[PDB]
Amino acid sequence: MTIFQFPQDFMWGTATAAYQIEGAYQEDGRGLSIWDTFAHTPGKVFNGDNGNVACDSYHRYEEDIRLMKELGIRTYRFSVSWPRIFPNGDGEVNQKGLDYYHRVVDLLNDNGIEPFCTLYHWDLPQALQDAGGWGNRRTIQAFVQFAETMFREFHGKIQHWLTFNEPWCIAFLSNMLGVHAPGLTNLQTAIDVGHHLLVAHGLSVRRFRELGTSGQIGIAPNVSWAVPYSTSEEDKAACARTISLHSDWFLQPIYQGSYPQFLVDWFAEQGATVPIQDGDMDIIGEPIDMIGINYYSMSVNRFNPEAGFLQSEEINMGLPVTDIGWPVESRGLYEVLHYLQKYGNIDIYITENGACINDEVVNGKVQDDRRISYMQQHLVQVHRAIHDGLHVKGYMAWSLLDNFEWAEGYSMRFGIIHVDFRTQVRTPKESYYWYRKVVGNNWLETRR
Amino acid sequence: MTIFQFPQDFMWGTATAAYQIEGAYQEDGRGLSIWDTFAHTPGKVFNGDNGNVACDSYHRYEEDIRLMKELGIRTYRFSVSWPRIFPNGDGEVNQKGLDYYHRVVDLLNDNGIEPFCTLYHWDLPQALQDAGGWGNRRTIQAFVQFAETMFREFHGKIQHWLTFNEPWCIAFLSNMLGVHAPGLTNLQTAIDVGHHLLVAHGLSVRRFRELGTSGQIGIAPNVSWAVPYSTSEEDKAACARTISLHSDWFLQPIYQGSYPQFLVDWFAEQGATVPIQDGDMDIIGEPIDMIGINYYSMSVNRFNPEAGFLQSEEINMGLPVTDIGWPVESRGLYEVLHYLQKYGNIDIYITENGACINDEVVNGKVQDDRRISYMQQHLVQVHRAIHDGLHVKGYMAWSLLDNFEWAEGYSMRFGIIHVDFRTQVRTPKESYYWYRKVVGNNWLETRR
Amino acid sequence: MTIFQFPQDFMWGTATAAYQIEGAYQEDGRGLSIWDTFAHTPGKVFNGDNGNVACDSYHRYEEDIRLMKELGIRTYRFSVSWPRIFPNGDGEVNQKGLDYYHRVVDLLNDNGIEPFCTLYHWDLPQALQDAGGWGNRRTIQAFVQFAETMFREFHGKIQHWLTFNEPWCIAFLSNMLGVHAPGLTNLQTAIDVGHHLLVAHGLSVRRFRELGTSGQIGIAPNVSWAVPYSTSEEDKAACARTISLHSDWFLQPIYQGSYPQFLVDWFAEQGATVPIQDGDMDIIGEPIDMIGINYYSMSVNRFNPEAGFLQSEEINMGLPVTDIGWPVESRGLYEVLHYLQKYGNIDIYITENGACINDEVVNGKVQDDRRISYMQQHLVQVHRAIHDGLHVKGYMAWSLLDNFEWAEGYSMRFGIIHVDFRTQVRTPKESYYWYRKVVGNNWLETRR
Amino acid sequence: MTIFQFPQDFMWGTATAAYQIEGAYQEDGRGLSIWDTFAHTPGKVFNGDNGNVACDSYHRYEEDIRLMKELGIRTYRFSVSWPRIFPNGDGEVNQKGLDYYHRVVDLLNDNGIEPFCTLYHWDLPQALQDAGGWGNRRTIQAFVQFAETMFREFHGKIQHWLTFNEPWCIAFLSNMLGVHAPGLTNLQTAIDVGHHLLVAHGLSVRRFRELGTSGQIGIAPNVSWAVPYSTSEEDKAACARTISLHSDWFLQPIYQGSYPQFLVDWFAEQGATVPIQDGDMDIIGEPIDMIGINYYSMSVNRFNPEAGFLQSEEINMGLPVTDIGWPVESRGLYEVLHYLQKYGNIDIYITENGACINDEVVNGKVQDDRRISYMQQHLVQVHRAIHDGLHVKGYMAWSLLDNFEWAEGYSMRFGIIHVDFRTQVRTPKESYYWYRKVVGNNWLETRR
Numbered sequence A, B, C, D: 001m002t003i004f005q006f007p008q009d010f011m012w013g014t015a016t017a018a019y020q021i022e023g024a025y026q027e028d029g030r031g032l033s034i035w036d037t038f039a040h041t042p043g044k045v046f047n048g049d050n051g052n053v054a055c056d057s058y059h060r061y062e063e064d065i066r067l068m069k070e071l072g073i074r075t076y077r078f079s080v081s082w083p084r085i086f087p088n089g090d091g092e093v094n095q096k097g098l099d100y101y102h103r104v105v106d107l108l109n110d111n112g113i114e115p116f117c118t119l120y121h122w123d124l125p126q127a128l129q130d131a132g133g134w135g136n137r138r139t140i141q142a143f144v145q146f147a148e149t150m151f152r153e154f155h156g157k158i159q160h161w162l163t164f165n166e167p168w169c170i171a172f173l174s175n176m177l178g179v180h181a182p183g184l185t186n187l188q189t190a191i192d193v194g195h196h197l198l199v200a201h202g203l204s205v206r207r208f209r210e211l212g213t214s215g216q217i218g219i220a221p222n223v224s225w226a227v228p229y230s231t232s233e234e235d236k237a238a239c240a241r242t243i244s245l246h247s248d249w250f251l252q253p254i255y256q257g258s259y260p261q262f263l264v265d266w267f268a269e270q271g272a273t274v275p276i277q278d279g280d281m282d283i284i285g286e287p288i289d290m291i292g293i294n295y296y297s298m299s300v301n302r303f304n305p306e307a308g309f310l311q312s313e314e315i316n317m318g319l320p321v322t323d324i325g326w327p328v329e330s331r332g333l334y335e336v337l338h339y340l341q342k343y344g345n346i347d348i349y350i351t352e353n354g355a356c357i358n359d360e361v362v363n364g365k366v367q368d369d370r371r372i373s374y375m376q377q378h379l380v381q382v383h384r385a386i387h388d389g390l391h392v393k394g395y396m397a398w399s400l401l402d403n404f405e406w407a408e409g410y411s412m413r414f415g416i417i418h419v420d421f422r423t424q425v426r427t428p429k430e431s432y433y434w435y436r437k438v439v440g441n442n443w444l445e446t447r448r
């Protein structure tokens, strides 16, 4: 019915993370992460799943890259397992660790696929967690050394860099709500972890600059969009809190040199303060070349005093949901892209977008029509924003592979390629071939 | 997992129209309407369907009323076949015609079901169409005689009245786009039909008072909602035209004594003018007690000069659609009700809301889950508006029965009760038992 | 391949309750009960189900009695809707109420079906709940007036009487755990309700004699069985608490004139005391002719301080469960009957035993093999106890009809006759024809 | 719902036996067994199945061991084909025989899998049976030489040893009931075979000690658990006979230096006596390091004079049964583990536990949910006993592979891995992957 044509140099991609796909959790001197520890704790991850084996992409990456070439993709976003480089986070490197990632990146560049490297996708070496992890400013220097080691080792091989993936998850999901590793439930710790994350980000971009490292560097928050149930100022405040804690809390420091004051005030009445030290805000405000945004769903919220620490309750409006329960409402991606212009018409990459659809292989194919539907509606919104003049530069599907989906284990499938975890067999889904058509054509035609 | 509770006085109902359900088109001296003529012309209605038999509700109204009694609804919205009362539309009444609506209306009242009487649901007697139909002010007086006769015979039996159902369909779809009877394609004619419709409404309302007829009176427009694809003024203009022709074009005269000037300007540059005669604007501005709103779908539009006489192109956003092709996006219902607050916090009834879901009887049941899905999402928006303080007084599902869906014939099913047109067997759908629960409880719970 | 033959005098029956099946909740001057109020409150009953219509056994009792006649059962256990007799619970009787139970009871007797009359199956008139309900000794006198009126009008027509059905549910599930009407969560209140229940039982029994009313009278507790996970004294203590609150708490006063002291001690350390007034313990100890026992499931428990007010955690042993989640382990029925020999070899009827098996009608049949499986295993335990010399006199399957299963609504089917709640059509399940054979033959044969 | 966590050094395993899996029945000089002879007799084994080919594990063991490594198992229990070592049972060894088992054990140790070696799993060389088999004390010395040859040949390669598997089967099933090879029906012969088995066990442990052989050594009885139908002393005696003949008959000699006197008395009235010679009881009482117990089912028994030579009749209580007809009641494993403390808190391995579930491969997988269910309930009971302080040290699933299931042939499948006997293809069942999770995690979570 309608054709949606994309910019000539638009960057089409797919995305993974190291712990979700790699496996080989004890191989080549790799040290333990806080997620190994968390997944090896009963009751923390559904069905007692863990990432020991996952997709075995530590051994099978060549097959995965061949599939990405046939997909016609232009970029591949991946993360580096910190404990594969610094098993303890303390200076003594593991060359085997570095050697793995060199084989990966060389195959990517030899196939015409630009690496998009996420440094921190949640696998803090357990060694550093023992000392307090991100709640301890000592981890700041350990990360800066980790980033520096990568900036040095892959200079000229990698042109796109991200420091941290989804700071709201690392800070508040992990240390306020206890849902992800390390599993704490204390607001003050969550705020501490966020701040030390912003400082470690600042210091790593600085090093990037001073090292003259090739390419550009930014950060990749997951973005919330909530819309008020009523016209009340209370419901509007509740949505502002939900929205701002995901994005503004981390971006207003980076771009505007301050935390969102209304959230500062809110936490202060809960007895928490940001542990800002002298020079910190100056470190966080180091200029970045772009940001990545991660989008999945949006909500209709109202104010409720009993609804968690943000007193923001989500309403079930009856919309259809993915197989993980998130409602499909693609307009939120357009709204939030316009919302973020408050930081300017900055370069924006869509670093994650996808749907949980748990169809498996029947008669040799995975008929994940609901995933094509999801992608169609949301790719319409990307084109829509680009047309409004926003500098949206790329789009990465979450995910290339079905993988270990954190506290849900393997029960929640996000890939455009099916993985049978008993055999490690890869089966491109129907969304894979549909996506191959869109990226190969560089235009979308909405149908069905 | 959210509870939505409705006001104690909330009016739950169901809606039909005479030609869509009644049948008996040559029975008891009923004369031909423009829809008999249109449906008897090859090429006009899908598959050559017509309303000669329909649901045979001329004979089976007792079963239909038994089913709505077991449904627990408090109101039943129906329309009167004009050529059953005045077969030629020129004075000699058909007591047989009046007799039918008396057994229906009395049977409703005896069951505690409030009649909600639509006088004009598109079945204009062919005799008046020969004289030019609505383009000829002579039928204005013919309609006023019809309404008086109905107020006269049914005083105290009907407490809720509507003059016209969906004026934009009567005028522009029928006489500009040629899709509905009488099927002309002339801009100026469409504007004439619209104006004389409003004059007949004003005069019938001005007479309603003068007779002291029981109850309240209003009009039931179908309501459009469009949102711009881009931020441009042209796209916002294109959406304003789409929205305003459905509602503003008719409601601004009634409430504010003027036509939307920006559309007047639009048509005058196409060679069309409104034939206002002295006293007309004052006849139209006769105060009404409430309005009905008919909502199905909403759209994302852009400005396009090649896109019809409103130059407003609606974009396929990839959203899921019903079995007739209309996307499901319930927030437009919340949006348009707030839009309509420009006319004051007037009493508003949702006289139509529904979905084409073409599921048939399998193992004795109609598993129309997509209709339950649609109805729940839109009933959430009704509660949301009432909660915002808007005077939303009732809700009528379109439709009680699968019926003759105009140019689509019987191929497009909207009912909550399935009708097998080969046997006339009624089978309540799963949506029926779902609705029975909501109306009996007077609160909704989001699920699935 | 084993034959189990039952005594010649063995009483085979079926069991229902008034609110679960009757419907006609506003018909013939029936007043509101606490379950009407509870089921009409959002959030209390799954899906917002209620008993307004239920199985419509207020009107369809003749069909239900025809089906139990063809079943060949010798007794039918039913309960009396108190607010059908005394709508406000304060003296002015409703002859219409009494009339209904007279046509039922006479129709049963005419068919050779012995009425087994439960006076209280949880439908306390709302008027008394406004005054505090069972926590207020004033309703004690209100109940005694109810029972006398029933002994009075139904002398010689009913030869089997039960005062209360499942006292632990009436007291602790309803007023400590808040799961059943009236839904409070107060320890002290629950103990008050329990004590005043026993006083009303004693007085109604003491009056039973004094009126020389025909037949025998007892009480029908639901019975718990728990076995310790470990050999520890704490685990055995935790199981003793679980077991004793269901049965001992009520049966030790009636038979041995004292409350279980170890639970008295338990509650007194939580701040709760039994409100015994002079003469109370002697009123309760009124001799009764037999008891009813209600058995469904048994458990493996351990001591856990965080595990509710009894600090007894039941362990998921991995056993298969019914469609409501209760594990099937029939030996607890044999176990608890032997346990109850501490009160002498008293006459015991199994007034309830059944399974939630949610199979529906497929090709005209309900292939509820898991219900046949459950019933056979438990009827083996009945024969085993009789063979051990215990005075087990009868067995009533819960339930005759799929009905309103309290906080689960209609989603949890226990019937041996399927009821389609959209049509009220009765379809006897395969368990029905299976039961017809066992009761007609008066012996069981193990198979499958 | 509940997590069951196991001891850190708990030994997870799987189990096989030589004749059930090996095949190559005439290869490399292997001599005939009493089971070859029995399976080659018409009417003895269902469908005329035999073990000539079986699973061909004589040739395919490398595939089976690779599958066991991926399973994450810590031990593998297997048996040695006596006629592969001593084709005639008389001194002249077959080095080829020894060579096969050396290739097996070396692959096991190289993969980190500890061998658990059963010396006698029923394949008595037919040569020795011709001379009377176990009914002849000459076989005692032939076995001691066989065991000595293995103790010598695999010293330092094998650390866990069992002399005999299921003496009740070798003695009473084979020589009293005629169900297994050699198929005799004479009580006196059965008693003779049992006694010569106990002496050959004693002499082999002694040799083990005197040889200083590596590791520990014990015996692996199959254990009965019967529970009385009634409270009668007769039913309790009948259960004691059933229970004691399986375990006490062999363990009371080994631990307490005497046969169970009440069974001695019982057989004496049937004209049978134990052929005890001077020094025999002293040989049998040689100390052992541990025992293995084999558990599958439990029964409810009563006394019946016509019910076999133990006058102990099993009652069909209506419980669900595996596909071989044995009821699933996991509590018997806990009861019998406590029962055996009468011999002290000895080290106990669960050397066989499994279910007959005959699901085959459908759409590439074997959906043996009933096997996962069975294992879940019984693994709960192992944890339960460990928690009571019993020295339960390991658990071995029966079986790794579908195999030749004695008189039932191949029609009764026990494996966690499917074997197609027409192709020899191995397919891990769903229980395989479920078991992999449990052993890899070392905890169980009960679900479904």
Ligand SMILES: N=NNCCOCCOc1ccc(-c2cn(C[C@@H]3NC[C@@H](O)[C@H]3O)nn2)cc1
Binding pocket: A017, A020, A166, A173, A177, A179, A222, A296, A352, A405, A406
């Ligand atoms: N009672 N209240 N407290 C607890 C209430 O539940 C709280 C659970 O919250 C959440 C919220 C959000 C997520 C989540 C997962 N992704 C997708 C991953 N993206 C990064 C990549 O690696 C993907 O795998 N995005 N968001 C999970 C859980």
Ligand SMILES: N=NNCCOCCOc1ccc(-c2cn(C[C@@H]3NC[C@@H](O)[C@H]3O)nn2)cc1
Binding pocket: B017, B166, B173, B177, B179, B222, B294, B296, B352, B398, B405, B406
């Ligand atoms: N060239 N391209 N072709 C497509 C050209 O279509 C242009 C638009 O056509 C239309 C537009 C709108 C309708 C319509 C039907 N209802 C539902 C009824 N409501 C009144 C009641 O009686 C119900 O039965 N509401 N609106 C039908 C046709």
Ligand SMILES: N=NNCCOCCOc1ccc(-c2cn(C[C@@H]3NC[C@@H](O)[C@H]3O)nn2)cc1
Binding pocket: C017, C166, C173, C177, C179, C222, C294, C296, C352, C398, C405, C406
């Ligand atoms: N927080 N966790 N949530 C779970 C909290 O549940 C706690 C326990 O709830 C219960 C416990 C027991 C029952 C119950 C139902 N019957 C069957 C009926 N017998 C009387 C007859 O009328 C039948 O209809 N017997 N017992 C219901 C609910």
Ligand SMILES: N=NNCCOCCOc1ccc(-c2cn(C[C@@H]3NC[C@@H](O)[C@H]3O)nn2)cc1
Binding pocket: D017, D020, D166, D173, D177, D179, D222, D296, D352, D405, D406
């Ligand atoms: N009329 N009366 N007489 C005859 C009545 O039937 C008697 C039949 O008895 C039995 C009793 C028990 C078994 C049996 C098989 N396993 C399983 C194997 N375990 C060792 C391993 O190798 C497995 O393959 N355990 N027990 C077979 C038959």
